Design an enzyme around this catalytic site. Structure first.
Site, mmCIF file in Angstrom:
data_model
loop_
_atom_site.group_PDB
_atom_site.id
_atom_site.type_symbol
_atom_site.label_atom_id
_atom_site.label_comp_id
_atom_site.label_asym_id
_atom_site.label_seq_id
_atom_site.Cartn_x
_atom_site.Cartn_y
_atom_site.Cartn_z
ATOM 1 N N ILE A 20 0.836 -1.188 0.000
ATOM 2 C CA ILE A 20 0.000 0.000 0.000
ATOM 3 C C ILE A 20 0.882 1.254 0.000
ATOM 4 O O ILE A 20 0.596 2.192 -0.735
ATOM 5 C CB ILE A 20 -1.021 0.014 1.213
ATOM 6 C CG1 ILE A 20 -2.097 -1.043 1.042
ATOM 7 C CG2 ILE A 20 -1.737 1.362 1.358
ATOM 8 C CD1 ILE A 20 -2.882 -1.289 2.311
ATOM 9 N N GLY A 21 1.937 1.258 0.821
ATOM 10 C CA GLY A 21 2.805 2.418 0.993
ATOM 11 C C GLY A 21 3.572 2.414 2.308
ATOM 12 O O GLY A 21 3.982 1.363 2.790
ATOM 13 N N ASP A 59 -2.510 14.415 13.478
ATOM 14 C CA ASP A 59 -2.045 14.251 12.097
ATOM 15 C C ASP A 59 -3.231 14.067 11.125
ATOM 16 O O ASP A 59 -3.175 13.251 10.184
ATOM 17 C CB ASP A 59 -0.999 13.105 11.947
ATOM 18 C CG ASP A 59 -0.023 13.337 10.748
ATOM 19 O OD1 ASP A 59 0.185 14.505 10.343
ATOM 20 O OD2 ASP A 59 0.500 12.357 10.180
ATOM 21 N N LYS A 105 -4.951 14.674 7.920
ATOM 22 C CA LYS A 105 -4.675 15.144 6.556
ATOM 23 C C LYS A 105 -5.411 14.149 5.673
ATOM 24 O O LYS A 105 -5.766 13.071 6.165
ATOM 25 C CB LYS A 105 -3.180 15.180 6.247
ATOM 26 C CG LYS A 105 -2.415 13.908 6.565
ATOM 27 C CD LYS A 105 -0.994 14.054 6.189
ATOM 28 C CE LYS A 105 -0.137 12.892 6.577
ATOM 29 N NZ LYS A 105 1.340 13.230 6.316
HETATM 30 C C1 LIG Z 1 0.511 3.474 3.729
HETATM 31 C C2 LIG Z 1 -0.647 3.872 4.595
HETATM 32 C C3 LIG Z 1 -0.918 5.221 4.798
HETATM 33 C C4 LIG Z 1 -1.997 5.593 5.594
HETATM 34 C C5 LIG Z 1 -2.781 4.604 6.177
HETATM 35 CL CL1 LIG Z 1 -4.128 5.204 7.159
HETATM 36 C C6 LIG Z 1 -2.522 3.226 6.003
HETATM 37 N N1 LIG Z 1 -3.282 2.219 6.570
HETATM 38 C C7 LIG Z 1 -2.900 1.690 7.903
HETATM 39 C C8 LIG Z 1 -3.618 2.389 9.026
HETATM 40 N N2 LIG Z 1 -4.193 2.910 9.934
HETATM 41 C C9 LIG Z 1 -4.376 1.723 5.895
HETATM 42 C C10 LIG Z 1 -4.588 1.912 4.512
HETATM 43 C C11 LIG Z 1 -5.739 1.398 3.875
HETATM 44 N N3 LIG Z 1 -6.035 1.541 2.493
HETATM 45 C C12 LIG Z 1 -5.417 2.365 1.595
HETATM 46 C C13 LIG Z 1 -4.828 3.560 1.999
HETATM 47 C C14 LIG Z 1 -4.204 4.355 1.042
HETATM 48 C C15 LIG Z 1 -4.147 3.995 -0.309
HETATM 49 O O1 LIG Z 1 -3.511 4.858 -1.184
HETATM 50 C C16 LIG Z 1 -3.301 4.577 -2.572
HETATM 51 C C17 LIG Z 1 -2.196 5.400 -3.281
HETATM 52 O O2 LIG Z 1 -1.213 4.483 -3.799
HETATM 53 C C18 LIG Z 1 -1.506 6.513 -2.459
HETATM 54 N N4 LIG Z 1 -0.453 7.175 -3.296
HETATM 55 C C19 LIG Z 1 -0.744 7.813 -4.583
HETATM 56 C C20 LIG Z 1 0.902 7.358 -2.770
HETATM 57 C C21 LIG Z 1 -4.745 2.794 -0.708
HETATM 58 C C22 LIG Z 1 -5.379 1.996 0.262
HETATM 59 N N5 LIG Z 1 -6.618 0.711 4.624
HETATM 60 C C23 LIG Z 1 -6.407 0.550 5.935
HETATM 61 N N6 LIG Z 1 -5.321 1.030 6.563
HETATM 62 C C24 LIG Z 1 -1.433 2.879 5.197
#
Ligand SMILES: Cc1ccc(Cl)c(N(CC#N)c2cc(Nc3ccc(OC[C@H](O)CN(C)C)cc3)ncn2)c1
Ligand SMILES: [Mg+2]
Lengths: 257, 293
Positions: free
Chosen positions: B11-12, B125, B127
């Site tokens: 996811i990131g 935080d 955003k």
């Molecule tokens: C990592 C990252 C950043 C912020 C968060 Cl809260 C989370 N967490 C863990 C927690 N608390 C998620 C994400 C999620 N789903 C999701 C979140 C963004 C996303 O972004 C897609 C793009 O790729 C972003 N980009 C362009 C850089 C896709 C799915 N579902 C449940 N928890 C993970």
């Protein structure tokens, strides 16, 4: 008053959930109340050496009492349990916690860094990561807002009394933080100003002098016998001007209850 | 321990640790897994995140489902939401977001946040990247890695707090006490941003940030914000800008929308609207829960 009342109410519920088990020390094969008294008193010293929040000390002690409620510990491992607990409470509560080497150092290399870190994971596991426990300090701080007017001597003395109750598992494991904070605030208030537990705190908490009396009779004897107790780091700490020298004040001879 | 999860895709990267989409092979359930390589022991951000999410069960706060805790790694198992609000807003470039969705989202965020403030938690935080959306129309607060449990009344907590663009002026001016109001501020900025689809105050520095806020809301004096001129990072050479007509700030907004955003972006933290009190604002009189596209 944005959420002060939602918050008091929540802390009242969580304090029941977060409660140590009142009789754990009899089930402990090897340690005593006296040994726990020694370990708490050292923790006070440690908080003073590292300039930790009072809250951080109350939290660690909560972690220890709850850990010892389900986990039997030999006397040579009690300090290890208390080190991890203070390290965990620092991470939870401090802007700048001491680093793990600082905690190893103050045990006087009784334990390695591996042991301290292994104990930390174990304490997390037993407490199921449930670290935002209510404390006596959290209750006092809300009770302070009910002073008329604010009085720094009253606040520092209530903190000093609430803190002494951390030392002696018998009798204070049997009281909830909100009740101890009740006794402490009233006893502080009476000693300094002559006043009593305000009506506005009866409204807020549902506690009265009568409900507070049993905790309050205990706290009064602790205050009277404080200068002769085997453990003395809270008395010395509260001689500092930061807490307005309150451990220097005279306890009242009677409470007239 | 991770025997029943099958990784789907990364996811990131979070406040700390690395996030994958995974599915439970026994239940079919889709999850986000935050991995923490375990030094100084368990990170204070992870300790706070776990304790505080376990306390917070709300339709609009991400569910922490499990903690898998090995001598080697610590995994947090979250329920998976399909995207964050940021990605949604970028995707809405040419449509833009329908009012009814903006309203419903804000109503929901204010519900998640009220629950947090009721349970003595500051998020610190908020955003669009931390706000997660599903396909049915829910939005949820996520990333409690900067959150903390607060006392009543507040002590001084970490100054080094809130992604700059969403950061309240009491933080920027160095007030020794901030409280729940800093999260209302961030939600103000995001309400604004869902409407315009660009950030309301995109500063590059702390002074750039303040000045941008000042050009939009006026430089605050002692009439609007009693105590400002005594705040540690207040400077009496601050340019003094006129307060703008609030219909200019977010032009598509109707009267009730402006009224609401104005109360969220109130300078004085003490006069800034609470999440609780904002739920009853006339803005939300017709609120529904539409699904997004
Ligand atoms: C990592 C990252 C950043 C912020 C968060 Cl809260 C989370 N967490 C863990 C927690 N608390 C998620 C994400 C999620 N789903 C999701 C979140 C963004 C996303 O972004 C897609 C793009 O790729 C972003 N980009 C362009 C850089 C896709 C799915 N579902 C449940 N928890 C993970
Ligand atoms: Mg025993």
């Amino acid at each position: 008053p944005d959420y002060h009342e939602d918050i008091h109410t929540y802390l009242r519920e969580m304090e029941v959930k977060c409660k140590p088990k009142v009789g754990y020390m009899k089930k402990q094969p090897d340690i005593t109340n006296s040994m726990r008294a020694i370990l708490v008193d050292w923790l006070v010293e440690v908080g003073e050496e590292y300039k930790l929040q009072n809250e951080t000390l109350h939290l660690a002690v909560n972690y220890i009492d709850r850990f010892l409620s389900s986990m039997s510990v030999l006397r040579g491992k009690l300090q290890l349990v208390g080190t991890a607990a203070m390290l965990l409470a620092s991470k939870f509560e401090e802007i700048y916690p001491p680093e793990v080497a600082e905690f190893v150092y103050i045990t006087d290399d009784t334990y390695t860094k591996k042991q301290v870190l292994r104990m930390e994971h174990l304490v997390l596991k037993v407490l199921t990561f449930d670290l935002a426990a209510p404390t006596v300090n959290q209750f006092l701080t809300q009770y302070f807002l009910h002073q008329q007017p604010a009085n720094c001597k009253v606040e520092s003395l209530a903190m000093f009394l609430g803190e002494l109750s951390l030392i002696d598992a018998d009798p204070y494991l049997k009281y909830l933080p909100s009740v101890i904070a009740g006794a402490a605030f009233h006893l502080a208030l009476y000693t300094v100003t002559g006043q009593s537990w305000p009506e506005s705190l009866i409204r807020k908490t549902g506690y009265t002098l009568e409900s507070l009396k049993p905790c309050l009779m205990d706290l009064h004897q602790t205050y009277l016998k404080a200068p002769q107790h085997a453990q003395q780091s809270i008395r010395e700490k509260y001689k500092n001007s930061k807490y307005h020298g309150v451990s220097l004040l005279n306890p009242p001879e009677t409470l007239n209850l | 321990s991770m025997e029943n999860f099958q990784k789907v895709e990364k996811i990131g990267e979070g406040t700390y640790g690395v996030v994958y989409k995974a599915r439970n092979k026994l239940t079919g359930e889709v999850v986000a897994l935050k991995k923490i390589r375990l030094t100084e022991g368990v990170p204070s951000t992870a300790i706070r995140e776990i304790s505080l999410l376990k306390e917070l069960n709300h339709p609009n706060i991400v569910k922490l489902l499990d903690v898998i805790h090995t001598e080697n790694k610590l995994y947090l198992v979250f329920e998976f939401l399909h995207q964050d609000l940021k990605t949604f807003m970028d995707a809405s470039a040419l449509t833009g977001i329908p009012l009814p969705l903006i309203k419903s989202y804000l109503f929901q965020l204010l519900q998640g946040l009220a629950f947090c403030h009721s349970h003595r938690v500051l998020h610190r935080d908020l955003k669009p990247q931390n706000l997660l959306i599903n396909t049915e129309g829910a939005i949820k607060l996520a990333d409690f890695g900067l959150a903390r449990a607060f006392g009543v009344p507040v002590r001084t907590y970490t100054h080094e707090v809130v992604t700059l663009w969403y950061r309240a002026p009491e933080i920027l001016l160095g007030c020794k006490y901030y409280s729940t109001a800093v999260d209302i501020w961030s939600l103000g900025c995001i309400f604004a941003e869902m409407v315009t689809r660009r950030a309301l105050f995109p500063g590059d520095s702390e002074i750039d940030q303040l000045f941008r806020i000042f050009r939009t809301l006026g430089t605050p004096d002692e009439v609007v914000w009693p105590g400002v001129t005594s705040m540690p990072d207040y400077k009496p050479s601050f340019p003094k800008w006129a307060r703008q007509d609030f219909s200019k700030v977010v032009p598509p907004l109707d009267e009730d929308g402006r009224s609401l955003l104005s109360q969220m972006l109130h300078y004085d933290p003490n006069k800034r609207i609470s999440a609780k009190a904002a739920l009853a604002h006339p803005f939300f009189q017709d609120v529904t829960k539409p699904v997004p596209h």
